[PDB]
Amino acid sequence: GKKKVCYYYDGDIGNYYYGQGHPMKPHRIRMTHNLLLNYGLYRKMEIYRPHKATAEEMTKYHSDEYIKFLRSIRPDNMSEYSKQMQRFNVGEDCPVFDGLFEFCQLSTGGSVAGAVKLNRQQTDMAVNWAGGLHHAKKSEASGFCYVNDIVLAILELLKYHQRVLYIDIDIHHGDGVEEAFYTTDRVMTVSFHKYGEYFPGTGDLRDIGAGKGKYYAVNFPMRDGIDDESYGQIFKPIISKVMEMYQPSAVVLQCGADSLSGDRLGCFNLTVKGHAKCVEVVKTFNLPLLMLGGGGYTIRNVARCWTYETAVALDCEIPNELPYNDYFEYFGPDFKLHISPSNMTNQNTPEYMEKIKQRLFENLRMLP
Ligand SMILES: CCC(O)(O)CCCCC[C@H](NC(=O)[C@H]1CC12CCN(C)CC2)c1nc(-c2ccc3nc(C)ccc3c2)c[nH]1
Ligand SMILES: [Ca+2]
Ligand SMILES: [Ca+2]
Ligand SMILES: [Zn+2]
């Protein structure tokens, strides 16, 4: 039936700025919030302002030196940290910007607070669109991510859940999360991503985990142009088999919107309905679920996507005609919620999709 949904948002999140020309735009979180408020989606959700996660909470995964660096570096003192900046990969993709640490604290706070709420059985679903920063490593920033809120949220869920399933539908491989849990069977990581001449270069079909974690990392490598039909045909069968074999007690779903058609950095062809079908599939298993954001670089489409996925979480039908909102002009020329796919060729033939699915099924047969 219909579930209780808790949503995490801090009104200051949209003011963090990565710099001119940087594709990562925290303002998309504020556009999402304003659109979902104007659709009236606040009437059915408990809205919470996340606390600022402490350096101590972040060191449950990240190194003390790395978190100390993030808490200390500022654009005005960067000159004195050239050595640490290289060591921690702070540069073009992961720049130093005003309020960087506070941005990490808010992104992380939402994810950890959502995990605590789920652990206490006070909600069925927890949503943090500011989270899902899946590339951050133990002592290194990567791919616009500095603190891995997902790993921290999973560590929190592991306090009450023996097995946690992580699913990542961002176009980029969820490498930081996969790496963090690569040698354990208490987390199964499943990533669907573009693979081949594409960041971060990891997520081959043959990367399946190591030691006690062997068979607990699942990667579905895809080519350009995947559409709703093709994605839908492999997502539900894979997730159903993973649910059957692994029997997780909690799920974390990274909803990176850069897998949508027309994304500035992505080359997939999903519509908002095709992307949201993943949320519908996961929600059907009736397990405690933490829904997170991630990529998404055509910001009007990210706001549409996450507003629709919040409506999906709430089992609320919302009209295609967009309500008036603070960013109404960004949704022209149509002013509709749903998007059309492009004429791009789907390089993922039906035979390729079935072959990769069958290889993943062989690996899933190896679970106990
Ligand atoms: C939030 C989750 C997520 O969606 O998975 C994150 C995606 C991260 C993508 C990172 C990717 N990085 C890369 O491909 C790494 C090899 C390089 C080195 C750095 N240059 C700037 C780009 C090539 C990349 N970087 C860019 C890019 C494009 C334009 C930029 N423009 C500016 C001004 C600054 C940084 C810029 C970075 C595109 N692709
Ligand atoms: Ca992914
Ligand atoms: Ca694992
Ligand atoms: Zn991405």
Containing structural domain, residue 280 = 1-368
Method of structure determination:
X-ray
Find the 227 Cα to ligand 1 centroid distance in Å. 24
Torsion sign across C-alpha atoms 47, 51, 53, 56: negative
- Residue whose pair of structure tokens reads 């859940």 in the numeric block: 161
Q: Would residue 173 show up in a list of annotated catalytic residues for this protein? A: no
Q: One-letter amino acid identity for 97?
A: F
Neighbours of 319 (CB within 10 A): 9
Cβ density class 341-359: b for 16+ within 10 Å, e for less: beeeebebeeeebeebbee
The finding on whether 199 has its CB within 6 A of some atom of ligand 1 is yes
* Structure token pair of residue 117: 């709420």
- CA nearest ligand 1 atom 1, residue: 295
Of 207, 208, 206, 166, nearest to 186 (Cα)? Answer: 166
Choosing from 93, 135, 148, 299 the residue with most ligand 1 atoms within 8 A of its CB, the one to mutate for a pocket test is 93
Greatest CA span in the chain, whole angstroms? 56
Count of domains in the chain? Answer: 1
The finding on whether 140 has its CB within 6 A of some atom of ligand 1 is no
Are 132 and 293 contacting, i.e. CB atoms less than 8 angstroms apart?
yes
SS3 190: strand
Q: Give the annotated binding-site residues for Ca(2+).
A: 168, 170, 172, 181, 184, 187, 191-192, 216
Q: Structure resolution in Å?
A: 1.6
* Ligand 1, atom nearest to 20 Cα: 33
How many CA atoms lie less than 13 Å away from 297 in the CB half-sphere? 20
Find the 172 Cα to ligand 2 centroid distance in Å. 5
